[PDB]
């Protein structure tokens, strides 16, 4: 086995830059590990299944580069319904020009380009080893949901389905 | 031998010291992985450090065979000297390299400027943009019967790690290398995952792209977006887009014939490398506010002629730093942001 990139990164983050610049052959294999984490290939060489876990991170842009407020988001996004229906969290990181909020981004990039140090807030940025250890320690936990949170979950799901159900 | 087995890797400049034994090979005992400066040249560059007329004559002295285009070679001077390469603490690095794309009619010296920038830089790699035997510039796969296995070939961008690379005929370059430089721009690096390997490479490689339109000719009355024949992400990747017009005008075209019918080369190389090795510039409050004012005033162009991106904020101080290190001052000044805004007004309008 010589997997493209989904096989050397078994248990971890698999990221995709320029998601709309790919083709149908890439999308049909990305959707298969997105739904079920077990690629299966049946060609003249082998008929076998490779199982890997990959928290697909995707970065995409619309059809005309930026957004369009006169266009619907189903028409602004070229991806089909089965692709983003499987996507639970989609982040519309849209930039809006402003007078007050743009100055903080400008001050922050001039502060990090002036020197490598971060801004003087009353907080220190944690190094990679400590939160890597925290993620490895938190991953062994197995939480169990209660009944009082169950009655809130089913009511919010019923209300969200009725609100979403143009 | 056993001792020095962990100090060799492909893609790096090396100097070996051995014995040419012929049982033909060399028994390498000493390996060193890697213009001379005198004390007379440092007096000349220290004498030329405080005059405020240095930049224009240094930009005019690079190519005397090409008439006009002063601000384009001003940006090319700021381009070949470099940036700062800031590495953040416990996070990702910051891009110090600048990238320039040049478009226009094919009548001028865009193909004659690459030979000058290839022969006058510290180290430069030029490619045609079409004709790479591998998958592009960065690498290629090969089979060897010696080991009976598959090895990796490094075609280009991985060789030059701090210098500059030049690609002419940018529109003829396919999408595979475009996806690779999409990673190249923001990355100031690259990444590859292939059958049996996954990795990321980080060699500095400022790009100089030269393109031609798909219509063959271009004038002011045509729209400036569809004439480029490139996506908007590539316009956002490249920092400075220089448009050179060549409409026939009887007033300006009278002296080109007598000019082509009619400071030096070893000095600017020593100037650029001494600025690259010794002085690192830092920011001041006098140059933060004027660049904040310029970025907020342009974020005008969005309604009139050209899109504005987050990256452009970074490229608007990179150039300032550049000018501040052209004068080799220990910190930046307000005039560096002013000449960066002047370069922006020439390359945008």
Curated annotation (Swiss-Prot), chain A:
Domain of life: Eukaryota
Binding sites annotated in the UniProt record for ATP 2: 86
Short sequence motif Arginine finger: positions: 85-88
Record-listed ATP 1 binding positions: 61
Localization annotation: Cytoplasm; Nucleus
Misc. comment: Present with 166 molecules/cell in log phase SD medium. Early fractionation of eukaryotic MCM proteins yielded a variety of dimeric, trimeric and tetrameric complexes with unclear biological significance. Specifically a MCM467 subcomplex is shown to have in vitro helicase activity which is inhibited by the MCM2 subunit. The MCM2-7 hexamer is the proposed physiological active complex.
Role of this protein: Acts as a component of the MCM2-7 complex (MCM complex) which is the putative replicative helicase essential for 'once per cell cycle' DNA replication initiation and elongation in eukaryotic cells. Core component of CDC45-MCM-GINS (CMG) helicase, the molecular machine that unwinds template DNA during replication, and around which the replisome is built.
Subunit structure: Component of the MCM2-7 complex. The complex forms a toroidal hexameric ring with the proposed subunit order MCM2-MCM6-MCM4-MCM7-MCM3-MCM5; loaded onto DNA, forms a head-head double hexamer. Interacts with CSM1 and MCM10.
Family statement: Belongs to the MCM family.
Protein name: DNA replication licensing factor MCM7
Curated annotation (Swiss-Prot), chain B:
UniProt motif Arginine finger: location: 236-239
Binding site for ATP: 104-111
Domain of life: Eukaryota
Residues of the MCM domain: 54-261
Compartments, record wording: Nucleus
Job description of the protein: Acts as a component of the MCM2-7 complex (MCM complex) which is the putative replicative helicase essential for 'once per cell cycle' DNA replication initiation and elongation in eukaryotic cells. The active ATPase sites in the MCM2-7 ring are formed through the interaction surfaces of two neighboring subunits such that a critical structure of a conserved arginine finger motif is provided in trans relative to the ATP-binding site of the Walker A box of the adjacent subunit. The six ATPase active sites, however, are likely to contribute differentially to the complex helicase activity.
Subunit relationships: Component of the MCM2-7 complex. The complex forms a toroidal hexameric ring with the proposed subunit order MCM2-MCM6-MCM4-MCM7-MCM3-MCM5; loaded onto DNA, forms a head-head double hexamer. Interacts with CSM1.
Misc. comment: Present with 35100 molecules/cell in log phase SD medium. Early fractionation of eukaryotic MCM proteins yielded a variety of dimeric, trimeric and tetrameric complexes with unclear biological significance. The MCM2-7 hexamer is the proposed physiological active complex.
Family: Belongs to the MCM family.
This protein's name: DNA replication licensing factor MCM3
